[PDB]
Design a protein around this ligand. Structure first.
Ligand SMILES: O=[P-]([O-])[O-]
Ligand SMILES: O=[P-]([O-])[O-]
Ligand SMILES: [Ca+2]
Ligand SMILES: [Fe+3]
Ligand SMILES: [Fe+3]
Ligand SMILES: [Fe+3]
Ligand SMILES: [Fe+3]
Ligand SMILES: [Fe+3]
Ligand SMILES: [Fe+3]
Ligand SMILES: [Fe+3]
Ligand code: NI
Length: 225
């Protein structure tokens, strides 16, 4: 009668497992950079196609649940929220794939410099990813606010890294390619962090049936015309 609940809970756990999968992908992409591990980068590139599949499966299951049970209210919100989260997860995987591509290219020549700010960007981003997936599993609107502040740390680091790498590019032509490849990695981390904030926003909607958005440190009701 309400084995609707069994199927919705399984759908949600599928989405969360694909989440835990990209959480590991992002970890592995940044590890391929710091350890200069060609194989690990190649695994991330391969794993991107696994996540394309996961998106297809999530979408299939959402249709099965919607089409058989025709849910309303909370279960309907959860399923549509799952549809949206699975695209965010797939896109995060695209960005991890692109970081890994950059790692392979970086490995063609010697290390440019010590890595501090990029590892720190990644660390903050992986905290945000973990937190987003935990909000999707069990939403706390009062605490979900914290993701926005976390993102501001990633934005500030990105700006620093961008300025520093521009200086390296200008110092010598031999620094240019590595500095660009590193800058592009930083940019991909910054976007992944944005996606983590979007997972929190969608998770809040999933309970509220009303749109919230990060506005720099503040999670507000979508304040627009
Ligand atoms: O598989 P494509 O959306 O990156
Ligand atoms: O913090 P967002 O505007 O990239
Ligand atoms: Ca290149
Ligand atoms: Fe079952
Ligand atoms: Fe997609
Ligand atoms: Fe995509
Ligand atoms: Fe993809
Ligand atoms: Fe931000
Ligand atoms: Fe951004
Ligand atoms: Fe950002
Ligand atoms: Ni693909």
């Amino acid at each position: 009668n309400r084995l609707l609940n069994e199927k919705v809970e399984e759908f949600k756990k599928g989405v969360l497992k694909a989440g835990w999968f990209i959480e590991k992908m992002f970890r592995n992409s940044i590890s391929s950079l710091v350890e200069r591990n060609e194989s690990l980068a190649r695994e991330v590139i391969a794993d991107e196609e696994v996540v394309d599949q996961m998106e297809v499966e999530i979408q299939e299951k959402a249709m099965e649940v919607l089409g058989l049970f025709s849910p309303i209210g909370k279960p309907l919100l959860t399923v549509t929220a799952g549809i949206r989260v699975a695209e965010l997860i797939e896109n995060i995987a695209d960005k991890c794939h692109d970081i890994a591509k950059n790692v392979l290219e970086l490995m063609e020549e010697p290390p440019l410099k010590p890595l501090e700010d990029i590892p720190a960007m990644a660390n903050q981003t992986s905290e945000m990813l973990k937190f987003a997936l935990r909000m999707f599993a069990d939403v706390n609107v009062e605490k979900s606010f914290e993701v926005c502040r976390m993102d501001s740390k990633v934005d500030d680091l990105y700006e620093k890294v961008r300025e520093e790498l521009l200086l390296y590019m200008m110092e010598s032509p031999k620094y240019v390619k590595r500095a660009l490849l590193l800058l592009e990695i930083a940019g991909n981390i910054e976007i992944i962090a944005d996606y983590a904030t979007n997972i929190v926003e969608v998770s809040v909607y999933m309970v509220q049936g009303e749109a919230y958005k990060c506005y720099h440190d503040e999670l507000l009701l979508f304040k627009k015309s």
